[PDB]
Amino acid sequence: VNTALQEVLKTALIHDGLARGIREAAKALDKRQAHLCVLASNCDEPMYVKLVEALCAEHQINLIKVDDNKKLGEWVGLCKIDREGKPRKVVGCSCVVVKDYGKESQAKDVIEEYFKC
Amino acid sequence: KSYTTPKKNKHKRKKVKLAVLKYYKVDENGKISRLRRECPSDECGAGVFMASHFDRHYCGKCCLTYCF
Ligand SMILES: [Zn+2]
């Protein structure tokens, strides 16, 4: 499902279906427009984890766990420069709400059926 | 350069930490409890809070003052 997460992040990037930042994620949750939320657990956070759990477990949320904060920025392209190699300095994030408008795709129905259960 | 008249420095906004973690209150339940009143106007969004002053709460980009 990791390749499916790669493709859904790439389609959110190509259709601008993403809101980076946890305050943008909270604003999207307050405006009732969230579809997919991605979380990082068992990482370098002392007290962020209970806040992000208590704000992400609201309603109609499917949870995907990420093992590291700093590696999450490369699928989303925070400092996506010098693609032939590695980017210089990419910060790590905690939660980005996927505002994906694309529902008709090759694996979109598959991941929707996986998230339905 | 340093002239006879001293130059007043620009407004250095001090970098505050754990501000985004200070909006809602963390309890045993998952419900939200914010300490700032919501913005009912259409200029600022539903997720936009007010300020936290001693006497009156102020908008952001609305620049609207609602007294009591
Ligand atoms: Zn306002």
3-state secondary structure B6-22: CCCCCCCCCCCCCCHHH
CA atoms A89, A95, A100, A106: torsion sign: positive
Q: Is the dihedral of CA A59, A65, A71, A75 positive or negative?
A: negative
Chain B residues whose beta carbon lies within 8 Å of the beta carbon of residue A50: 26
The sign of the dihedral angle between the CA atoms of B36, B41, B44, B46 is positive
Q: Cα separations (Å) of A4 from A11, A108, B34?
A: 10, 9, 36
For residue B59, CA distances in Å to A31, A103, B4, B67 come to 18, 37, 40, 12
Which residues pair with residue B65 across a beta bridge?
B58
Indicate the resolution in Å: 4.0
3-state SS assignment for residue A25: helix
Q: Between the CA of residue A109 and those of A7, A11, A114, B21, what are the distances in Å? A: 13, 14, 8, 35
Residue A57 has its nearest CB partner, among B21, B30, B48, at B30
Decide if A26 and B47 are in contact by the 8 Å CB cutoff: yes
Nearest to A52 by CA among A60, A65, B35: A65
Cα(A34)–Cα(A26) distance, integer angstroms? 9
**Where do we find the tokens 């006879």?**
B4
Task: Name the residue range of residue A72's domain.
Answer: 1-117
Read off the amino acid at residue B47.
G
Coil, strand, or helix at residue A55?
Answer: helix
Q: Do B26 and A30 touch (CB under 8 A)?
A: no
Q: How many domains does chain A have?
A: 1
Q: What are phi and psi of B19, to 5 degrees?
A: -75, -45
Compare CB distances from B26 to A23, A27, A51 and report the shortest one's residue: A51
